[PDB]
Symmetry: C2
Subunit: 123 residues, 2 copies
């Protein structure tokens, strides 16, 4: 593989879709489903880059990012935020030194399942 | 599994992403990478529904759809078009009886690879 990528999102659908995308390109994906798990993964299997969901609970992506970037063992790992909408100018500004960019999450699965169910399920 | 779904797209990235999405939901995906292959698959392993890429070459999705819907062995299989942009009113109109709806293809992989490469590749 070339480059290890930690994928952090609370949706196992989103995580699996990113895993497929990364694997086809020979990136090595590792996964986490919460910010708490993300931090454990950074300590155990440090990646070359993190993809980090903004939402999530009980710790969100921004709060997780603060812990990543404050803990001196992990601060130099680049982070791309995973978002449902573009970052506001205020967010891009404030977090500029902490993040490299953002990636909009795919929504396709919602439209895909809805369309298939509408056709094939008993109405 | 519940429902067999034939995924037809010339991008093996797009096909693999749809396969992952369908599998998580217990749909049974089968794949094809051209309209010619799509027709072979319909004859060998008839699915409950087809997801059909509009573009492609040397036969496009519209031309493949015409063959699906004209051949009496396959005409009753529902089809969802896979598109890079919404169908025009003219397309939705003309092909209304042939198709159930369309699904916009995800673009995430392009943004994902570009962002990771920009960070990690030697500039």
């Amino acid at each position: 593989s070339l480059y290890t990528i930690l994928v952090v999102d609370d949706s196992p659908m989103i995580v699996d879709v990113f895993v497929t995308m990364l694997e086809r390109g020979g990136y090595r994906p590792i996964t986490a489903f919460s910010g708490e798990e993300c931090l454990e993964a950074l300590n155990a299997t440090p990646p070359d880059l993190v993809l980090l969901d903004i939402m999530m609970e009980p710790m969100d992506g921004w709060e997780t990012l603060e812990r990543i970037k404050t803990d001196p063992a992990t601060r130099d790992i680049p982070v791309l935020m995973l978002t449902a909408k573009p970052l506001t100018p205020e967010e891009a500004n404030e977090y500029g030194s902490y993040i490299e960019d953002y990636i909009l999450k795919p929504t396709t699965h919602h439209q895909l399942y809805e369309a298939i169910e509408h056709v094939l399920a008993r109405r």
